[PDB]
């Protein structure tokens, strides 16, 4: 049959080396299971493999099956059989599906497809579905029907699925294109921010590989990402992925953990990956962004005297991810959504890969390398943004987040960072006050309704709105009421004058000043989008 031949006789394309690129790109390891054969085996099977010209390349065959004591899951490795040009005869130490391991430097003129024939009689043809080669749902459906193994492999452009046959048949017996295009796009959108088009796919072309463990929930790790087999209806059906906000968030967040290291430092590990989560949500086009309002920052910084590392986490027991995740996102909203620098994040990723600091080696140092590199990437002095976000508080402590780390930010380190950042021109806007949400977008029962404030929506920045009205303020007790201030982007309490230190801020047009704020010498300013402060 032509079905057997399609899998028994194939050309296997070269893929890059995963360890090399995980180091270079500062990611968790991608998969090296890029090359299914679609042949399953049983323990003791004899397998003839005829191999063509290998062009000097060392290649091998790996048999992939299951691991785990508590419950079973597809393993990231298995029995490996060396291959040579010509005739090979393998005896399978165990059962599984075969993968050709052809990993090499892609730019070499020896990195050509290798032809490999596993003739009738050796193992069983299961098949797999290639997006580029097979193209149609009708062919997917046909291949899935003819398959027999526990697991069936679907190879997209950027992600693969290696899921339980019975689950695919249960949710997607006749169609895969919608599913595989969606998940390729989710991966591709994360890669888009990382600014790696110079090297992907020319030098790096490995896939992410999604397995369906028989336990846990969802996660991403070196080699594989996992979604429990009971959860696949919420992966394989786009309508289900889109049915609630969380259904794209969770998986996008887990994939983000693969990609976050360049920009991440301990204290930030469960928020920095939400740059990716929020970008996925944005690209999917249905739901508004996630995170607290800027009020949470004001409270942490100015009411409670917190820095970045302990923002919203006084007792030092859990990162405040809902507050922290707004920081990277505000940089995306301003530079990307407002189009002030549409390659800002790609530039910043590149610079952080140059900085090349692990997440834990020196988080206080890394926090300041991030502020410096953000300034360099924007070609703007982001002192005020990083000040609001707590980056210029001195710190001398330890933290715990997937390990204990010494957190040390010295006055000198602070001084050096500000000096470095002062080489760039003043920012064009006070976008530390930016939002991509407004109150009218949410029902009153949604956390964002009461959190997002009144002013500072991104259009005020993109259109460079000016304050033209007769803006006034009244103080009654600790209550500030602003009149005619809807054109401003925020309201600030500052010491002595507009160049004095910030005491408090709000993006609400009515707000209570905390008891802890020191009000002697304090003046109230409306902030214009471009940074002008107007005494009220
Ligand atoms: Zn996480």
CATH number of the CATH domain containing 349: 1.10.390.30
Compute, in angstroms, the gap from residue 55 CA to the centroid of ligand 1.
43
Q: Which residues of 292-309 are buried (b: 16+ CB within 10 A; e: fewer)?
A: bbbbbbbbbbbeeebbbb
Compute, in angstroms, the gap from residue 140 CA to the centroid of ligand 1.
33
Residue 382 token pair:
């982001």
- State the Cα–Cα distance between residues 421 and 104, nearest whole angstrom: 41
The backbone region for 291, taken as left when phi is positive above 0, alpha when psi lies in -120 to 50, beta otherwise, is: left
Residue 469 token pair:
């009205």
- State the Cα–Cα distance between residues 253 and 218, nearest whole angstrom: 10
Residues 6+ apart with CB under 8 A from 477: none
Residue 83 token pair:
């291959």
Compute, in angstroms, the gap from residue 86 CA to the centroid of ligand 1.
47
How many Cβ atoms are within 10 Å of 389's Cβ, its own excluded? 23
Tell me, rounded to whole angstroms, the distance of Cα 446 from its chain centroid: 25
3-state helix, strand, coil in the chain (%, to 5): 35, 25, 45
Compute, in angstroms, the gap from residue 134 CA to the centroid of ligand 1.
35
- Angstrom CA distances, 45 to 1, 60, 89, 120, stand at 21, 17, 10, 13
Compute, in angstroms, the gap from residue 270 CA to the centroid of ligand 1.
5
Torsion of CA 212, 218, 220, 224, to 10 degrees: 0
The backbone region for 460, taken as left when phi is positive above 0, alpha when psi lies in -120 to 50, beta otherwise, is: alpha
Sheet of strand 79-83: strand arrangement: 79-83, 59-64, 96-101, 36-41, 124-125
- Angstrom CA distances, 213 to 163, 186, 216, 442, stand at 9, 21, 7, 36
3-state secondary structure of 369: helix
- State the Cα–Cα distance between residues 504 and 524, nearest whole angstrom: 9
Residue 309 token pair:
């590392």
Instruction: Return residues with CB closer than 5 A to ligand 1 (ion).
Output: 270
Tell me, rounded to whole angstroms, the distance of Cα 112 from its chain centroid: 32
- Full residue range of the structural domain in which residue 324 is found: 254-432
Tell me, rounded to whole angstroms, the distance of Cα 187 from its chain centroid: 9
Contacts 24+ apart (CB under 8 A), 438-445: 441/288, 442/288
Compute, in angstroms, the gap from residue 250 CA to the centroid of ligand 1.
9
Would you say 257 is a known binding-site residue? Answer: yes
Would you say 259 is a known binding-site residue? Answer: no
Would you say 164 is a known binding-site residue? Answer: no
The H or E element that residue 38 is part of is: strand 36-41
How many Cβ atoms are within 10 Å of 403's Cβ, its own excluded? 10
Assess contact for 211 and 226: CB atoms under 8 A: yes
Residue 408 token pair:
């040390």
Compute, in angstroms, the gap from residue 220 CA to the centroid of ligand 1.
9
Assess contact for 313 and 395: CB atoms under 8 A: no
Residue 536 token pair:
């009220």
Q: Which residues of 484-493 are buried (b: 16+ CB within 10 A; e: fewer)?
A: ebebbbbbbb
The H or E element that residue 250 is part of is: helix 245-259
- Angstrom CA distances, 179 to 171, 173, 210, 226, 355, stand at 11, 12, 13, 16, 37
Backbone phi, psi, residue 143, to 5°: -60, -45
3-state secondary structure of 218: strand
- State the Cα–Cα distance between residues 67 and 224, nearest whole angstrom: 13
- Angstrom CA distances, 266 to 317, 362, 488, stand at 13, 9, 35
- 104: closest CA among 225, 206, 238? 206
What resolution in angstroms, rounded to 1 decimal? 1.6
Question: Obtained via which technique?
Answer: X-ray
Assess contact for 340 and 385: CB atoms under 8 A: no
Compute, in angstroms, the gap from residue 73 CA to the centroid of ligand 1.
20
- 381: closest CA among 339, 332, 431, 346? 431
Would you say 246 is a known binding-site residue? Answer: yes
Compute, in angstroms, the gap from residue 447 CA to the centroid of ligand 1.
21
The H or E element that residue 533 is part of is: strand 533-535
Would you say 270 is a known binding-site residue? Answer: yes
The H or E element that residue 493 is part of is: strand 490-495
Residues 6+ apart with CB under 8 A from 248: 186, 241, 242, 280, 281, 284, 287
Compute, in angstroms, the gap from residue 275 CA to the centroid of ligand 1.
12
Compute, in angstroms, the gap from residue 469 CA to the centroid of ligand 1.
45
The backbone region for 316, taken as left when phi is positive above 0, alpha when psi lies in -120 to 50, beta otherwise, is: left
Compute, in angstroms, the gap from residue 121 CA to the centroid of ligand 1.
46
Compute, in angstroms, the gap from residue 267 CA to the centroid of ligand 1.
12
Backbone phi, psi, residue 156, to 5°: -95, -170
Compute, in angstroms, the gap from residue 99 CA to the centroid of ligand 1.
30
Assess contact for 291 and 325: CB atoms under 8 A: yes
The H or E element that residue 185 is part of is: helix 177-193
Compute, in angstroms, the gap from residue 269 CA to the centroid of ligand 1.
7
Assess contact for 142 and 127: CB atoms under 8 A: no
Determine the angle formed by the axes of helices 363-378 and 411-421, rounding to 10 degrees. 10
Assess contact for 210 and 162: CB atoms under 8 A: yes
Residues 6+ apart with CB under 8 A from 290: 245, 249, 274, 277, 278, 281, 322, 325
- State the Cα–Cα distance between residues 277 and 324, nearest whole angstrom: 13
- State the Cα–Cα distance between residues 303 and 305, nearest whole angstrom: 6
Strands (E), 75-228: 79-83, 86-91, 96-101, 114-117, 124-125, 129-130, 151-155, 159-164, 208-211, 218-220, 225-227
Compute, in angstroms, the gap from residue 218 CA to the centroid of ligand 1.
10
Residues 6+ apart with CB under 8 A from 1: none
């Amino acid at each position: 049959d032509k079905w057997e031949k399609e899998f028994r006789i194939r050309s296997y394309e070269p893929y890059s080396n995963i360890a090399e690129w995980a180091d270079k790109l500062m990611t968790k390891k991608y998969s090296d299971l890029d090359n299914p054969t679609g042949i399953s085996v049983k323990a003791g099977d004899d397998i003839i493999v005829l191999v063509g010209d290998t062009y000097g390349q060392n290649i091998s065959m790996q048999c992939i099956w299951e691991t785990g004591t508590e419950y079973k899951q597809t393993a990231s490795s298995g029995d490996v059989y060396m291959l040579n040009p010509g005739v090979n005869k393998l005896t399978m130490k165990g059962e599984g599906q075969l993968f050709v391991m052809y990993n090499t430097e892609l730019t070499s003129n020896t990195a050509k497809p290798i032809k490999i024939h596993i003739p009738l009689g050796s193992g069983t043809v299961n098949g797999f579905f290639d997006l580029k080669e097979h193209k149609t749902d009708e062919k997917y459906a046909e291949l899935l029907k003819k398959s027999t193994h526990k697991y069936f492999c679907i190879r997209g452009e950027k992600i693969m699925f290696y899921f339980h046959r019975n689950k695919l048949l249960e949710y997607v017996p006749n169609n895969i294109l919608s599913a595989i295009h969606l998940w390729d796009n989710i991966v591709g959108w994360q890669q888009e921010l990382m600014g790696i088009d110079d090297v992907r796919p020319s030098q790096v072309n490995n896939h992410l590989f999604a397995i369906s463990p028989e336990g846990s929930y969802m996660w991403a790790s070196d080699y594989q990402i996992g979604f429990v087999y009971t959860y696949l209806g919420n992966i394989l059906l786009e309508d289900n992925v889109m049915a609630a906000e969380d259904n794209a968030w969770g998986p996008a967040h887990e994939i983000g953990h693969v990609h976050q290291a360049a920009i991440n430092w301990a204290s930030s590990t469960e928020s920095s990956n939400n740059l990716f989560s929020n970008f996925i949500i944005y690209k999917l086009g249905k739901y508004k962004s996630r995170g607290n309002g800027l009020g949470s920052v004001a409270t942490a910084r100015y009411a409670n005297g917190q820095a970045w590392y302990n923002m919203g986490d006084a007792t030092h027991q859990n990162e405040d991810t809902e507050t922290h995740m707004r920081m990277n996102w505000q940089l995306w909203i301003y530079y990307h959504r407002c189009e002030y620098k549409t390659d800002f994040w790609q530039t910043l990723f590149k610079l952080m890969r140059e900085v090349n600091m692990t997440e834990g080696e020196d988080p206080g140092k890394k926090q300041l390398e991030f502020a410096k590199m953000a300034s360099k990437a924007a070609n703007q002095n982001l002192t005020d943004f990083f000040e609001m976000w707590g980056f210029f508080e001195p710190v001398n402590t330890t933290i715990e987040q997937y390990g204990t780390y010494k957190y040390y930010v010295s006055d000198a380190m602070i001084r050096e960072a500000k000096e470095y950042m002062a080489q760039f021109p003043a920012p064009k806007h006070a976008f530390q006050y930016i939002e991509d949400r407004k109150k009218s977008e949410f029902p009153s029962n949604d956390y964002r309704y009461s959190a997002v404030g009144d002013v500072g929506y991104y259009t005020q920045f993109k259109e460079n709105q000016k304050i033209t009205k007769a803006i006034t303020a009244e103080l009654a007790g600790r209550k500030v009421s602003i009149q005619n201030g809807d054109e401003a982007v925020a309201f600030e309490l500052r010491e002595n004058d507009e160049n004095g230190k910030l005491l408090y801020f709000s993006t609400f047009t009515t707000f209570e000043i905390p008891s802890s704020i020191l009000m002697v010498n304090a003046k109230l300013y409306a902030v214009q989008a471009d940074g002008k402060r107007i005494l009220l």
